From a paper:
ICAM-5, initially called telencephalin, is an integral type I transmembrane glycoprotein of ∼150 kDa that is expressed exclusively in telencephalic neurons. It has nine immunoglobulin superfamily (IgSF) domains, with a total of 832 amino acids in the extracellular region, a single transmembrane segment and a 64-residue cytoplasmic domain. The crystal structure of the four most N-terminal glycosylated domains (D1–D4) of ICAM-5 was determined in three different space groups and the D1–D5 fragment was modelled.
Interface B includes positively and negatively charged surfaces in D1 and D4, respectively, and four salt bridges. In the P21 crystal structure, we identified two similar antiparallel arrangements of symmetry-related ICAM-5 molecules with contacts between the N-terminal and C-terminal portions. In contrast, in the monoclinic P21 crystals the IC5-4D molecules assemble with an antiparallel orientation and the crystal lattice generates two similar antiparallel trans/trans zippers that resemble the assemblies described for other homophilic cell adhesion structures. One of the crystal lattices has a molecular assembly that could represent the homophilic ICAM-5 cell adhesion complex in neurons.
Numbering used by the authors: 1 to 378
The structure:
């Protein structure tokens, strides 16, 4: 039976910033001194003959070792305790996901649980929905270590569009009778797009006339999600507003175009799509042309016989003019024909043809007119 000093409790787990009572007791017949050694501030104090009690408050530091001591028979009696603070996982943070992520690519989940301790008792979990992607236990870390970090690389799936990812931190104090403390990050939603290497198909005529209405179509396939893809069509400058319809992962853009005197000649039909951050484009060179209709004119529509009539077919400054089988003489300017009205010329038709070359293409516009020979006696 040696005389001893005792400090209670020996091991203590207090939440950071918290407080606890420490009791020092001794069996020595009379103490010549007594007290408790700590850096911590105290609030309440209690005492007895063989014992002494302090309430230690506002304990921030991960590790502090108090020593309760007594002096009995000119000998120093000692007891050494241990006080360990713990912090709940108040901050659990998942790193921002890529705004758009490629399907078949990899992205990295990063969870961060600052300050939570002790680290050794921490278990971090990365989740996709209710499923656990990875589970990490920190057992074996230093006793004074606070905070934890878990990172994993996940493969993006078409399955994964609109899926929620979260991080889950778990502090296990159960051996100390303090149970479990857990908190989760706000879920992060994942966007997965898939864009095939192919440029969009653009269906257009190579030749377009000013004022004419022709169908134009742009299309693509293998687009996920097809709904989020934004397709732009236009002829040169002017923007077409096609009807974009979605069949499976394929889109179909259908529109109509009229040349405004923008162009004529060399122009581009552009179709560009954006899905995610990626963009595709297809350009078609298109020729526009102005082909003014040939003007067929009679000196008079109605004439008596013997009266002189001049029929002419005039065109724009461009084409080759053919009147009644006779090419314009000379070429490039209106062709004229003259005749004296006969009774046989009543209900007689005249014809003018304009032949224009555009990009090697031969284009014709035919026109007709009818002459009336007024009836009378001779
Ligand atoms: C529709 O019309 C447009 C023009 O309105 C037209 O675009 C042209 O495309 C050709 C190629 O198809 C371009 O030619 C290039 O010209 C550059 C100089 O600017 C050259 O250096 C390029 O040469 C490359 O390839 C060579 C081997 O073939 C290499 O030797 C060289 O190092 C380069 O790698 C290239 O030939 C031309 O510039 C444009 N025109 C304009 C005005 O931008 C387009 O082709 C038409 N579409 C169709 C289907 O015909
Ligand atoms: C701390 O000191 C000792 C720890 O054992 C306590 O001393 C005894 O406390 C019990 C409580 O039921 C009493 O029955 C005994 O008579 C006490 N013994 C003596 C010699 O005092 C003491 O009570 C504790 N003090 C506090 C505030 O917890
Ligand atoms: C669980 O963790 C979340 C995420 O860290 C905590 O929510 C945050 O709370 C603090 C302020 O108290 C701020 O960072 C934000 O207001 C929250 N961040 C968000 C919403 O992303 C939350 O406090 C924790 N829950 C607990 C304590 O159990
Ligand atoms: C899709 O086509 C449009 C046509 O307007 C492009 O818009 C312009 O493109 C020119 C030529 O490259 C650029 O110099 C301009 O900055 C663009 N202007 C405007 C107002 O958009 C557009 O760039 C194309 N889309 C993509 C992704 O390139
Ligand atoms: C200790 O005393 C302070 C005032 O100095 C008081 O505000 C606080 O409540 C006390 N701490 C406790 C009871 O843990
Ligand atoms: C997934 O991520 C791992 C880790 O970087 C990498 O080794 C692997 O190539 C990725 N899978 C792909 C790119 O399909
Ligand atoms: C993802 O989480 C949000 C809440 O943040 C929820 O509204 C949504 O339904 C979830 N998405 C799926 C597909 O579970
Ligand atoms: C028609 O009659 C007029 C007047 O006599 C004459 O000048 C002309 O040569 C005749 N022939 C034609 C085709 O005009
Ligand atoms: C000439 O005009 C007629 C009727 O206006 C039209 O039906 C025909 O297609 C034209 N001829 C040619 C060769 O296009």
């Amino acid at each position: 039976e040696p005389f001893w000093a005792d400090l209670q409790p020996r091991v203590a787990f207090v939440e950071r910033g918290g407080s606890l009572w420490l009791n020092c007791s001794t069996n020595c017949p009379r103490p010549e001194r007594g007290g408790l050694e700590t850096s911590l501030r105290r609030n309440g104090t209690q005492r007895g003959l063989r014992w002494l009690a302090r309430q230690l408050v506002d304990i921030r530091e991960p590790e502090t070792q108090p020593v309760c001591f007594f002096r009995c028979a000119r000998r120093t009696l000692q007891a050494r305790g241990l006080i360990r603070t713990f912090q709940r996982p108040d901050r659990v943070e998942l790193m921002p996901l890529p705004p758009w992520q490629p399907v078949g690519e990899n992205f990295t989940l990063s969870c961060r649980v600052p300050g939570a301790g002790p680290r050794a008792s921490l278990t971090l979990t990365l989740l996709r929905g209710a499923q656990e992607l990875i589970r990490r236990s920190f057992a074996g870390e230093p006793p004074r270590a606070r905070g934890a970090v878990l990172t994993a690389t996940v493969l993006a799936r078409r399955e994964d569009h609109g899926a929620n990812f979260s991080c889950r931190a778990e502090l296990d104090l159960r051996p100390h009778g303090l149970g479990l403390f857990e908190n989760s990050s706000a879920p992060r939603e994942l966007r997965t797009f898939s864009l095939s290497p192919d440029a969009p198909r653009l269906a257009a005529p190579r030749l377009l006339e000013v004022g004419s209405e022709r169908p134009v179509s742009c299309t693509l396939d293998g687009l996920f999600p097809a709904s989020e893809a934004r397709v732009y069509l236009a002829l040169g400058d002017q923007n077409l507003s096609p009807d974009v319809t979605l069949e499976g992962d394929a889109f179909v853009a259908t529109a109509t175009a009229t040349a405004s005197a923008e162009q004529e000649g060399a122009r581009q039909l552009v179709c560009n799509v954006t899905l995610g951050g990626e963009n595709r484009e297809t350009r078609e060179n298109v020729t526009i042309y102005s082909f003014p209709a040939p003007l067929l004119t009679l000196s008079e529509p109605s004439v008596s016989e013997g009266q002189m009539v001049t029929v002419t077919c005039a065109a724009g400054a461009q084409a080759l003019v053919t009147l009644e089988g006779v090419p314009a003489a000379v070429p490039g300017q209106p062709a004229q024909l003259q005749l004296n009205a006969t009774e046989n010329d009543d209900r007689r038709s005249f014809f003018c043809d304009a032949t224009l070359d555009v990009d090697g293409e031969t284009l014709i516009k035919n026109r007709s007119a009818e002459l009336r020979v007024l009836y009378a006696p001779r």
